[PDB]
Design a protein around this ligand. Structure first.
Ligand SMILES: Nc1ncnc2c1ncn2[C@@H]1O[C@H](COP(=O)(O)OP(=O)(O)O)[C@@H](O)[C@H]1O
Ligand SMILES: Nc1ncnc2c1ncn2[C@@H]1O[C@H](COP(=O)(O)OP(=O)(O)O)[C@@H](O)[C@H]1O
Ligand SMILES: Nc1ncnc2c1ncn2[C@@H]1O[C@H](COP(=O)(O)OP(=O)(O)O)[C@@H](O)[C@H]1O
Ligand SMILES: [Mg+2]
Ligand SMILES: [Mg+2]
Ligand SMILES: [Mg+2]
Lengths: 117, 370, 370, 370
């Protein structure tokens, strides 16, 4: 198991990434603000916290060259929607573009509530 | 089934399915009619020519463009082009495909309503949508922030977007494009004794413009270079086998984009129009607009166009701003590519104007949905 | 477990944990909303911006401060700020932490009751407490005797304390602070032709004020100096790369603190207000108050503010008194520092308003326990 | 001898003599220069056009306004307009007449200083003065108490006055006026397919605005009225004999005064700006300000604008306050009329900046004497 420390990671970040790896999401999450941008890992986590995910609304990791950014945006919007309503998380001033753009404050606001759940 | 993406430009028609990376059909937006007595057997039996057939038979035909300056001025010929597009080039039943159409900004509202009515009543499409061409050019570049310079055959327009938000008060539009450059090249070609006066010869001059014209990085020393030396001169062969030669007209034609006064227009060039569009935007987004100048349309294919725009906007910016111009090789199909992207998104499938919606609000539904 | 200390200022939010030496979260107390047309799909899903994201995207947002003059005027945006600070910036469940809030003196009583109701019914914190900001500034200095001059973004107030006892009858409050100096700087910037009018441009003027303004030791001499020479001129670069220059406005902005008539107010300056607060105290404690003038808040960070207050009060004192101004470098966080000190005292653990007390007395319990 | 009153607006120039009841000369504040090759022998000899001749020959000229937003942006063309005013329209030697000029509030100080230097060093006037346009509008109303709303071609501003005392902290200025409404009408005229692009066409759109536009008493029902019926449609004839028709654009243009967001501005409308200016005044004088809302300038000449303001302010007032707007027919010249009144008073004759004072203090004397 990967127990290394990065050059610039806090214990909170390391715990989040460690549970990412331990929970068994299909991608090996190395950077929180670099692997969640497609929201595919977040949707997987939603399944692990017993929040249902309709993958027919989820754009698969093989994105077409045309519109891949839009497909990822749609995935982030769906992830935010699943985090607000059925997951019951406090996400004031958070939108799908924030996860798409990797806003650390709003992303941590979601992953710590994922820890809590 | 699948959505159709028809980019009805002024000069060329771009059409195909959503999800493809290029338009399946690209043909001139013209209609040709015979202009001579039926002296050849079998040739006189066909009353109208639409696509490339009108271009290949232009020696005995009068060519008309149904759209001028992005406005459909002949609607019956536009329907001929739409039937040709659906039934001959794509060979699809429009009743089975939602169709995505495009338009320039600041256009008359009746143009959008009539094409909505045409698609729902003449073609009975299940759903349709009208999108702004510059926004689709932004979709094609994978960006949500930036000012787009779109230049096709009829209209030049600028649209600034930040984080997916447009600033409509800063949208600019100029009725100077490729067709006007062709007409100016026709006028300046008489200085060397060449004459081109029929609509067919206009297509010949268009081919010359697309093949030998370029944008000078500095017009005044290019003028001196062509006045002293011959190295700028190039030759072209006419359909009868005559050969013409141009040196100076190669860059004097595209210079009109930067100097519209060559054709008596008072308006500022495309560089000043882009800069003024940025200066109408809020001061906090100007740095991001200066770094995202997207080029689009066939008139932006001249060699040296991006370098000249870089130099002119840099001459206009506060120097501290990093001016960047984005000019992808696929610039000729950025609008269509963006349309296939948008029509492919699942988040867009509720944005279609369905026929049922149109059955309630009539053609005015297009102003609310689009 | 651990108590939370939240100093809800008019301009900035200071939050963290009791026992820490500095607030862990310091973000602007603003809410931003889009002011332009969304045109790209998927991007329009975000209706609100709260923290620094409202400041970075301010070019397309209208910014609202939920607190004015130390009064919470928007209670829904205030709930948004509290949700943001608890779940996004501190990332703690408020149901497990007693929360310490702050407030200015002479405030409307309903403000204190409403924040008590919010903390017990929206966040249902186990216990809470509302403290006066100047008292916490005394705790941060370690003193128990002295007059505190607190000046944040919305309110300037004076509170005298002797041997740990306040004199409430000598508490003075002035509704003039940093935001009013910003708006006055905007008003006087037009004299050079610099125009700032949007809520986003007010943040730029605030940045200019925090970077170039200072307090003159003698206003009439600095005015004559700027009227003679340009040696007081200084330049600032706008976000689009424009450069502005100000000389005289650098000290005329903070001079309003000593001359509130610049903005049309009839009230006396901060020096006279401090002196008058001392002259309302018992003559036996005035000597100790004159030796302990404690300043706090960002508005007390101007260069020369302590020298000017020292000179002005010396001019007002009976000459035989010794005037001392205390101006720690951590002046910007003295209220939060004193709140973490107070919340970490074991003797304070019985002063918390518990939820059981609130469930019986309602929101009015805060007037008794605090 | 007698004093000259010159009201240099952004769009029109009002000039005459003190003691007269109307300006003797009223002409556009423009300079025209030829933009075409000289094709008629002997007609090309004139390099520039200034007054009504620039407007009558605008078909072959490019038109420039020297003043924008009440700021003189071109000083050479401003001297041309002043020379035209003194020597061609009034036909007087300025060296024999004290000259009274006007200015908006919150203007750059260099503007007032430069016009002072121009009047003393170029026109060598014996004395001069610079007055505030809203104060003169109060003089024209025969009043010493009231809030004046002045709206001309470039600037809209509010000035509260009580018993002859201004409240400078409550003065509010908005850079939205008639020229911006003209540019917005141009933008929305394209919806019907009318295109206006040349500066001469801007003058045509201004004429259309001055003839067919009006303020809706309720914009949301006027929009539904124009959407359901053509009863609001009206026709206009272009200089080549073409006829245009507008219905909806007639009231959507002036609505920008109440909804500056139409042109992408964040600012509140003129009704809220007036109300906010009153609420910055002392609560004791607010009743008298609510009862004396003086209107001035050509942009206040729209039909129904006083009724709309009375309704909007009534909706903002505490209901107990009666709201009254004073909108005289001579609103277009209230500034000039007030200037001739002021220059006629014997108590004002000591207030002239004499050239001797200017020779010893320089152009900054205007800041002390005005
Ligand atoms: N390589 C090129 N160099 C110069 N002009 C070109 C080039 N390619 C296309 N054009 C011109 O651009 C115009 C067509 O561009 P397009 O974007 O298809 O316009 P539209 O969409 O209005 O039909 C024509 O005027 C054509 O002559
Ligand atoms: N170095 C500085 N010089 C002048 N003003 C400052 C400086 N730093 C901060 N300020 C001003 O002080 C205020 C900072 O907010 P703060 O003092 O925390 O008030 P509040 O507690 O009400 O939010 C703002 O008005 C800010 O412009
Ligand atoms: N009757 C009217 N209806 C609408 N607008 C008018 C009318 N009369 C004048 N205007 C507009 O008012 C402006 C001129 O007003 P004026 O007070 O002379 O401004 P300035 O003093 O700045 O030149 C122009 O924009 C003009 O179009
Ligand atoms: Mg085109
Ligand atoms: Mg504060
Ligand atoms: Mg005016």
């Amino acid at each position: 198991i990967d127990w290394t420390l990065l050059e610039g990671e806090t214990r909170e970040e390391r715990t989040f990434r460690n549970w990412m790896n331990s929970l068994g999401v299909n991608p090996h999450v190395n950077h929180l603000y670099a692997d969640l941008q497609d929201a595919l890992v977040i949707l997987q986590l939603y399944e692990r916290i017993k929040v249902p995910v309709d993958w027919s609304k989820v754009n698969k990791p093989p994105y077409p060259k045309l519109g891949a950014n839009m497909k990822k945006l749609e995935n982030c919007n769906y992830a935010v929607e699943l985090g607000k309503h059925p997951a019951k998380f406090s996400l004031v001033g958070i939108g799908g573009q924030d996860l798409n753009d990797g806003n650390q404050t709003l992303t941590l606001a979601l992953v710590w509530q994922l820890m809590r759940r | 089934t699948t959505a159709l993406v028809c980019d009805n430009g002024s000069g060329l028609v771009k059409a195909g399915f959503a999800g493809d990376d290029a338009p399946r059909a690209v043909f001139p937006s013209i209609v040709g009619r015979p202009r001579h007595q039926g002296v050849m057997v079998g040739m006189g039996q066909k009353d109208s020519y639409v696509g490339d057939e009108a271009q290949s038979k232009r020696g005995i035909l009068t060519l008309k463009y149904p759209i001028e300056h992005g406005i459909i001025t002949n609607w019956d010929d536009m329907e001929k082009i739409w039937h040709h597009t659906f039934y001959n080039e794509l060979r699809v039943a429009p009743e089975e495909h939602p169709t995505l159409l495009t338009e320039a900004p600041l256009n008359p509202k009746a143009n959008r309503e009539k094409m909505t009515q045409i698609m729902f009543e003449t073609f009975n499409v299940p759903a349709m949508y009208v999108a702004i061409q510059a926004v689709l050019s932004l979709y094609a570049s994978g960006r949500t922030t930036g000012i787009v310079l779109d230049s096709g055959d009829g209209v030049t327009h600028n649209v600034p977007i930040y984080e997916g938000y447009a600033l409509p008060h800063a949208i600019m539009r100029l009725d100077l494009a490729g067709r006007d450059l062709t007409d100016y090249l026709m006028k300046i070609l008489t200085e060397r004794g060449y004459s081109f006066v029929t609509t067919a010869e206009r297509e010949i001059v268009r081919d010359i413009k697309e093949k030998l014209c370029y944008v000078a990085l500095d017009f005044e020393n290019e003028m001196a270079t062509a006045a002293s030396s011959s190295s700028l001169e190039k030759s072209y062969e006419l359909p009868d086998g005559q050969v013409i030669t141009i040196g100076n007209e190669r860059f004097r034609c595209p210079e009109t984009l930067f100097q519209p006064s060559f054709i008596g227009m008072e308006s500022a060039g495309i560089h000043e129009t882009t800069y003024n569009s940025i200066m109408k935007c809020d001061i906090d987004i100007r740095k991001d607009l200066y770094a995202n100048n997207v080029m689009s349309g066939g008139t932006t294919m001249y060699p040296g166009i991006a370098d000249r725009m870089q130099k002119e906007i840099t001459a206009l910016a506060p120097s501290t701003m990093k001016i960047k111009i984005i000019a992808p090789p696929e610039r000729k199909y950025s609008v269509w590519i963006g349309g296939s992207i948008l029509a492919s998104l699942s988040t867009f499938q509720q944005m279609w104007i369905t026929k049922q919606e149109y059955d309630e609000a009539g053609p005015s539904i297009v102003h609310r949905k689009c």
